[PDB]
Symmetry: C6
Subunit: 194 residues, 6 copies
């Protein structure tokens, strides 16, 4: 995974953002992108390769992995990062538009404050929504056994996941990181309210 | 995949482009290249390795994968990115040609406006065409079962795809991204019309 | 693993840090990140692939690897690096906040000294805690044999780990590096006390 | 594959080259190197791994793959890129030699025009030759079945290729790119003739 | 493996070092890091995957690889590089400390000469020690056959190593590089003595 | 493989080198390093994995691959590049030493001419020697069949190589590149003689 372009744009955002937003961006880079790269991807590298079902039926492991894990966890977290980053991109775009206008003619006020606050609200909504969606897809514990009754599987088969404990650890970790980001958005909103 | 050269040229384009075009380029980089790298490629890494057919015939899995997936989805999306980027390259080339002419002698008007509008039209056509072609090759849902009657397969065989649900998710996602890009081209054209 | 962003921020910290802290950061980069990348990851690449159990039961190898190694060692060390780096990030953030304030108006004293000392204390606590947690999960010797009685394993099965001696070597090495970092934090605190 | 050095030298060439040559270099980078990296290599990754022959003879798959694909397609395209890039390197070398001479003493004319035109001719010859050679090795359609009668294969065996349709697609695509480059060289020569 | 940070710091050292030390650093980068990356790692990639024992006992290959190769050769060379680089880091740290002091107030003498000479001595000791340790672990020839009598192996089993001749070649090569580095340290010490 | 450091140093050499030497360095980078990376490594990736012997004896494939290919071809070419690059490093080191001396006080003549000519001679010797050594290890054609009578192989066994034709192609190609480099060294020596 290459996050260099997003990294550059978010650094530009960091130049124009509140201290709490600088903290939020640092959290994003260190505790979500860095981990997703260094640690989580290796854990999920063999999710399907080391997924074993007790059956001789051709095709049952495939459909039962697809049923157990409709979307992989690491893939969901990628999308979460992207969608909680988008509003900051919108905000910095608005800011640079106004700066370009200034240059053509020749500190949050007016439209920039409305846009910044609205972007905080959007990040909050996206984050809450991704947490909720995760909870409904998988909850927050991967059990080692998965029982599957999807055709072509005869009757109910037993299947076994790779690394359920490590995956549970990282699921809970990323949830905690998301909640911290949420608290930080709340702090931004409070600070502004004052 | 290395997109650094294209990234540089498209940043140069971004220096010379309308706000809506800046948004379009941001979408291109974040929601198509970044995803294709970080997420989709891992999903399609084992498309043929974990593609199982119920048969003892040597060669049937190979021909039935070739028949089920004439071109892989990720490979089609690569080409889509390239072809919708080409017109912007043409436009910036024309612009830098005129700037070089200016320098030799020693803000869209005349040929640059015609070229920019024509490039918007080309991007629109390419995008619509790729969407249509995808729909006819695969539609927008990968089913888990594929029935195959291609020689050397005896009679009709059953074959099973890896990760059909995740792939359906990402297919729909990329379709939505393409439609957003299309709406943005429409906004460019309207803005200019005013 | 990509540590470039953290590397940049920690270099900025290095610009503003005591000689002992510069040494600590050099240790962090050379004896923990560099090793974890170059050496340890190759050792742990086949932890589950070359993990063999004497059984015909489907699913027993998976659950017995999950039981033997709840979290992989390399994954634990990643998190250790991140958490012992966080306080330095907080400290440099505070410092740059005060510098930005100075610029708006137009050498450790006051809040910066309190914050720096408190950050040293936090690094010390995190380091000690990670060492302790490692000791309780695995101790400091990976034995070649692991006996497993987790369902679906019939009775107690014998299982065998890949590369236990090399892994023991690197476990002890990283422990020694952590203890050196701890001694360096102590030296920082003493130097300041004078 | 790392093309950074060649990329740098060809950018230097781009600084000193006609508009049509700038277009040719853009084509080279985007439609040949970028594709070969992002798309074609993944298609050819399992050319021999997923190449199956109907036989129990040890060694027949190996010799029959060597016979079916004497040189892999992606490897041929690498060499094509290199050889059509070489003349531009010669041209820019000549140019920088003359510039260095100018500096020692203290816009195509004379030897630079002869060299540039001769380099266009060389690129044209190399491109035509690679197209022809490809046609004679493989034509432009990979069939799914390959019949092989090379020792140690008993009688004639049947063998099956991985991804023949996708490979045919990319073969035709790269052929079209080569023909476009050829047309561009023709345009250069015409422009100069005027 | 990423050696960029160490590379940067050692370039800074190169700015402040004797000609013989510049040669030593060039040797380090070209004949140890470059080789370890480009060549040796590919040789050792399948050390355990292609390590075959003549037995049906589950677990015997694992314990017999662990016994034959307690630590892999490439992993030992990584640590050797790191430990022979550390003293140069100490020396440049001392130097930059004194330069920072100079700046606060506003060519090897005094403490810098003592530190530089002591660092040469440390590199010499570490290098000699790593050579000796290698000799005692493995000597300098990997034989193709390894006989193993470690539980659970019944009686004495025969096991076979991957690529023993290539590995012997690279072992001897790296030994010669180490001895050259040693001679260079001797030359440094002599030059200073004059 | 990472050749960035060597690339930088050789660019510095290019700043101080004759036109023929600039050509030689361009050849080195484009026709040896670039190819070895992009093309040859993929060809040799499965040299041992797809090396099949007709036998049930455990250990015979391993010893017969070690006997057929004592050192892999790509590994030999790595070392060839390094050793033919070393003299240029020596030459630029001598040059920068003299420039540093000049600076302390405050166009090939004297020691620099002797050193440059001697370095050309060294490159010539190393190149000729590597060509000769290759010829004696393997000649210049990899045959598909290899007959092996090394213990534990019973009697003489038949073994089969992966991709012998592609490998023969690249062997001949690299030989031709080496001979071109040799001709270029001869041209350097002649030019100087005048
Ligand atoms: C931008 C905003 C994004 C929001 C995304 C929300 C996603 C909600 C997914 C709900 C999936 C239900 C799946 C299911 O199988 O149905 C649950 C059953 O069992 C049950 O619990 C039945 C009751 C289910 C209650 C579900 C409450 C959803 C509240 C969403 C609030 C989002 C706030 C942003
Ligand atoms: C922008 C606003 C977006 C709003 C989106 C609204 C979505 C509403 C979904 C309603 C679904 C109803 C049908 C349903 O309930 O389907 C049930 C089906 C089976 O479930 P099962 O537990 O019975 O069997 C085992 C499931 N097992 C294998 C995963 C463990 O599959 C499921 O669970 C359903 C899982 C649904 C997950 C939804 C994730 C939404 C994430 C939105 C992120 C927005 C960011 C801006
Ligand atoms: C630069 C422009 C690129 C355009 C690319 C268009 C690609 C169209 C591919 C059509 C494949 C048909 C395959 C097939 O098997 O035939 C469909 C049958 O079943 C049927 O539906 C029969 C009726 C099929 C109607 C097809 C309408 C195509 C309209 C294309 C419009 C493109 C606008 C840009
Ligand atoms: C610049 C202008 C370009 C115009 C291009 C016009 C192309 C016209 C194609 C006409 C094809 C007629 C024959 C046909 O219809 O062949 C039917 C054949 C079988 O199909 P089946 O469903 O019966 O069996 C299962 C198919 N299954 C395995 C994929 C699910 O294969 C197919 O489906 C045919 C799929 C055709 C996909 C075409 C994609 C075009 C993308 C153009 C992008 C342009 C960008 C500028
Ligand atoms: C930021 C601070 C992070 C601190 C993290 C501490 C983590 C402690 C994990 C303890 C796991 C016990 C697992 C177990 O199975 O229980 C041990 C049994 O066998 C026994 O030894 C029973 C006695 C166990 C004594 C445990 C003493 C823990 C002291 C922690 C001190 C941390 C200082 C920072
Ligand atoms: C910020 C403050 C954090 C405080 C955290 C407090 C945590 C308290 C944990 C108490 C656990 C009680 C239950 C227990 O004891 O569970 C026993 C269970 C089995 O163990 P077994 O030996 O009987 O069987 C074999 C184990 N075998 C496979 C690993 C070899 O699993 C175990 O061992 C338990 C291992 C526990 C490892 C805890 C690592 C904490 C790292 C904290 C880092 C903080 C950084 C800021
Ligand atoms: C900066 C601080 C650096 C600290 C480095 C600490 C290194 C600790 C090495 C511990 C080796 C334990 C080997 C073992 O637990 O085995 C036990 C097994 C019964 O009997 C065996 O198989 C043993 C066979 C012999 C193994 C020899 C391994 C030598 C590794 C030298 C590494 C030097 C690194 C600097
Ligand atoms: C720098 C220039 C590079 C040029 C590279 C040309 C490569 C030609 C390869 C010819 C391979 C023939 C293999 C074969 O098996 O023989 C063909 C038979 O079946 C037949 O068709 C018999 C008639 C074959 C006619 C071949 C005409 C070759 C014309 C080459 C023109 C190149 C212009 C640059
Ligand atoms: C600088 C000037 C260079 C001139 C080079 C002249 C080369 C002359 C070659 C003459 C070859 C005569 C013998 C012959 O004809 O051999 C026939 C043999 C079998 O062929 P088959 O079809 O009967 O059996 C199946 C073949 N199957 C497996 C590939 C499908 O193998 C073949 O096909 C032969 C394939 C020949 C491909 C030649 C590619 C040349 C590329 C030059 C690029 C220059 C760039 C500057
Ligand atoms: C910073 C300095 C690092 C030094 C590292 C030295 C490492 C020495 C490892 C010795 C391992 C012996 C293993 C063994 O199995 O024992 C050898 C038996 O067979 C025999 O030869 C018995 C006689 C063994 C004589 C060993 C002499 C060691 C001299 C070390 C000198 C180091 C100078 C720096
Ligand atoms: C800073 C000062 C450090 C001083 C370190 C002193 C270390 C003293 C070690 C004394 C070991 C005594 C027990 C012993 O001798 O164990 C014998 C055991 C078996 O050996 P075997 O041949 O009978 O069976 C086959 C061995 N086979 C599989 C490898 C071929 O394992 C062995 O060989 C033992 C191998 C020992 C290798 C030691 C490498 C030290 C590297 C230090 C680098 C320092 C850098 C600053
Ligand atoms: C820096 C200089 C590096 C030079 C490297 C030279 C390497 C020579 C390797 C010779 C290997 C012989 C292997 C063998 O099995 O022996 C050949 C037998 O069959 C025969 O041909 C018997 C006669 C063999 C004649 C060998 C002549 C070698 C001439 C080397 C000239 C090098 C000039 C630089
Ligand atoms: C700086 C000066 C360096 C001078 C080096 C002088 C080296 C003298 C070597 C003398 C060797 C005599 C014994 C011998 O002849 O051994 C014969 C043995 C078997 O050979 P076979 O054909 O009977 O069986 C099959 C061989 N098969 C599997 C490879 C196909 O293995 C062989 O072939 C022997 C291959 C020898 C290759 C030597 C490569 C030297 C490269 C030097 C590069 C210098 C760069 C500065």
């Amino acid at each position: 995974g290459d996050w260099s372009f997003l990294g550059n744009i978010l650094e530009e955002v960091n130049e124009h953002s509140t201290v709490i937003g600088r903290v939020w961006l640092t959290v994003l880079f260190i505790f979500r992108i860095l981990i997703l790269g260094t640690a989580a991807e290796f854990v999920w590298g063999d999710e399907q390769s080391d997924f074993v079902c007790n059956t001789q039926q051709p095709g049952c492991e495939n459909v039962c992995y697809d049923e157990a894990f409709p979307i992989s966890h690491i893939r969901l977290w990628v999308l979460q990062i992207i969608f909680v980053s988008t509003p900051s991109l919108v905000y910095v775009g608005h800011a640079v538009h106004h700066v370009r206008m200034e240059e053509k003619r020749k500190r949050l006020e007016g439209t920039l404050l409305r846009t910044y606050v609205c972007h905080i609200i959007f990040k909050t909504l996206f984050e809450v929504g991704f947490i909720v969606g995760h909870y409904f897809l998988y909850g927050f514990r991967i059990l080692p056994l998965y029982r599957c009754s999807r055709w072509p599987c005869p009757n109910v088969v037993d299947c076994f996941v790779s690394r359920p404990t490590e995956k549970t650890i990282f699921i809970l970790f990323m949830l905690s990181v998301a909640s911290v980001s949420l608290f930080l958005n709340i702090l931004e909103m409070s600070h502004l309210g004052l």
